[PDB]
Design an enzyme around this catalytic site. Structure first.
Site, short mmCIF file in Angstrom:
data_model
loop_
_atom_site.label_atom_id
_atom_site.label_comp_id
_atom_site.label_asym_id
_atom_site.label_seq_id
_atom_site.Cartn_x
_atom_site.Cartn_y
_atom_site.Cartn_z
N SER A 215 43.11 37.38 35.43
CA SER A 215 44.06 38.21 36.20
C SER A 215 45.36 38.38 35.41
O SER A 215 45.33 38.95 34.31
CB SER A 215 44.30 37.58 37.59
OG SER A 215 44.89 38.50 38.49
N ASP A 238 38.76 39.59 34.45
CA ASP A 238 39.38 40.47 35.43
C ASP A 238 40.87 40.66 35.16
O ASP A 238 41.71 40.38 36.03
CB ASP A 238 39.16 39.92 36.83
CG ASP A 238 38.51 40.93 37.76
OD1 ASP A 238 38.00 41.96 37.26
OD2 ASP A 238 38.45 40.66 38.98
N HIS A 293 37.71 39.63 42.91
CA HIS A 293 38.70 39.05 42.00
C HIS A 293 38.66 37.52 41.97
O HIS A 293 38.76 36.92 40.90
CB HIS A 293 40.09 39.54 42.42
CG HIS A 293 41.12 39.36 41.35
ND1 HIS A 293 40.92 39.76 40.05
CD2 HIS A 293 42.38 38.86 41.40
CE1 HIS A 293 42.00 39.50 39.34
NE2 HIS A 293 42.90 38.96 40.13
#
Ligand SMILES: CC(=O)Nc1ccc(S(=O)(=O)Nc2ccc(Oc3ccc4ccccc4c3)c(C#N)c2)cc1
Length: 369
Positions: A215, A238, A293
């Site tokens: 992330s 991600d 996610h």
């Protein structure tokens, strides 16, 4: 309910803070060892998580009661397995996370013969972290906590970029510290743990360094690669590409692997990943079908199926199947670009998205013009 590493090595875990200030390095280390580690070791992390989620004082205590004694499958302060030099992964956490929340990934890499340094960022992107105001405070364990900063909308662009630069600096600093310990630099762990850091002397394969992150940490991978040529390759789980400046996309010499969830991604984000592509550079991308996610972070294992879906902690895919695919594809990519002498190339097909639960690249389409 965090899964054990699937590799043949038993896994140890310890924490390292040096120096003791908020400018020092704070990391959790997973390593091949010669299963009692506390998953979330302090109450303040739960308070921080509560702030991150947008809830009050009571929620913090609720999370603490629920998860406060939960462990992760690594042997706390177990001796480092002697006899061989290990490749090193520096790992960067997402927004609102902290160093201990990616142990499913850290432990699996360690079980395959990696040393993993999961940094705790002091860029105020962690839900919580701490430091000591001086040596006296460190000696009695008197912690000073820093909680996540929430930003005004007008601030976001500027501050997120400054944070990702601070994050890249902390990944490089963490690397420098570990490489210095590898060459025998004496360090005094600000935490007073029963693990001697002198064990790490001559234990690192200094040519086989990778950076991995989820992330916000995925953007940190890219910023770190661009700034630090000691890292040989990167895997962005991600990646949230928003914090990066436009100048960085064409300034990534090292091989880079994007492993995406299906439901997190969106064109604005995918466009920035594609800007990193160049005919003369190694780039791979896959998407895990049905994943969300949070499939990359440990809370995807912390609840049952139904409540997990409600909290977006679980996707349509099973959490173990999803982390298996990500880990195995990661190992194959690391073998290919770190030049590892292992059998991880058995999962080479996963790099190409060749699996029922994988998409090569992304299903999202963007202009090439
Ligand atoms: C809306 C939004 O920004 N969303 C968001 C943004 C970033 C992320 S992250 O990068 O995975 N960073 C990140 C942050 C916090 C994390 O702990 C959680 C997460 C969700 C929870 C939900 C209910 C109860 C407890 C929870 C604890 C974990 C974990 N693992 C990971 C996660 C969610």
């Amino acid at each position: 309910k965090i899964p054990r590493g699937n590799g043949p090595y038993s896994v140890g875990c310890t924490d390292l803070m040096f120096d003791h200030t908020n400018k020092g390095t704070f990391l959790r280390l997973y390593y091949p060892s010669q299963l009692d580690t506390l998953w979330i070791p302090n109450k303040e992390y739960f308070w921080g998580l509560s702030k991150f989620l947008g809830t009050h004082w009571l929620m913090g205590n609720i999370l603490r009661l629920l998860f406060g004694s939960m462990t992760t499958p690594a042997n706390w302060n177990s001796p480092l397995r002697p006899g061989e030099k290990y490749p090193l992964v520096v790992f960067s956490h997402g927004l609102g996370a902290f160093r201990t929340l990616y142990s499913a990934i850290g432990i699996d890499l360690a079980s395959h013969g990696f040393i993993v340094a999961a940094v705790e960022h002091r860029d105020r992107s962690a839900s919580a972290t701490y430091y000591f105001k001086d040596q006296s405070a460190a000696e009695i364990g008197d912690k000073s906590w820093l909680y996540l900063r929430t930003l005004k909308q007008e601030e976001e662009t500027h501050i997120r970029n400054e944070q990702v630069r601070q994050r890249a600096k902390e990944c490089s600093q963490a690397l420098s510290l570990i490489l210095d310990i590898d060459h025998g630099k004496p360090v005094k762990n600000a935490l007073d743990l029963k693990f001697d850091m002198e064990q790490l002397k001559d234990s690192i394969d200094r040519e086989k360094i990778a950076v991995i992150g989820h992330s916000f940490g995925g953007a940190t991978v890219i910023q770190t690669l661009s700034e630090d040529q000691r890292f040989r390759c990167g895997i962005a789980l991600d990646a949230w590409m928003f914090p990066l400046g436009d100048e960085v996309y064409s300034r990534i010499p090292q091989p880079l692997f994007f492993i995406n969830s299906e439901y997190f991604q969106y064109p604005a984000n995918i466009i920035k990943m594609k800007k990193c592509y160049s005919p003369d550079k190694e780039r791979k991308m896959i998407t895990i079908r049905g994943s969300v996610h949070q499939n990359f972070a440990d809370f995807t294992f912390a609840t049952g199926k139904i409540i997990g879906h409600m909290l977006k902690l679980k996707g349509d895919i099973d959490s173990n199947v999803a982390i298996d695919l990500s880990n195995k594809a990661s190992l194959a990519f690391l073998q290919k670009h770190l030049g590892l002498h292992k059998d991880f190339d058995q999962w080479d097909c996963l790099i190409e998205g060749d699996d029922e639960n994988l998409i090569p690249g992304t299903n999202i389409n963007t202009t090439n013009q």
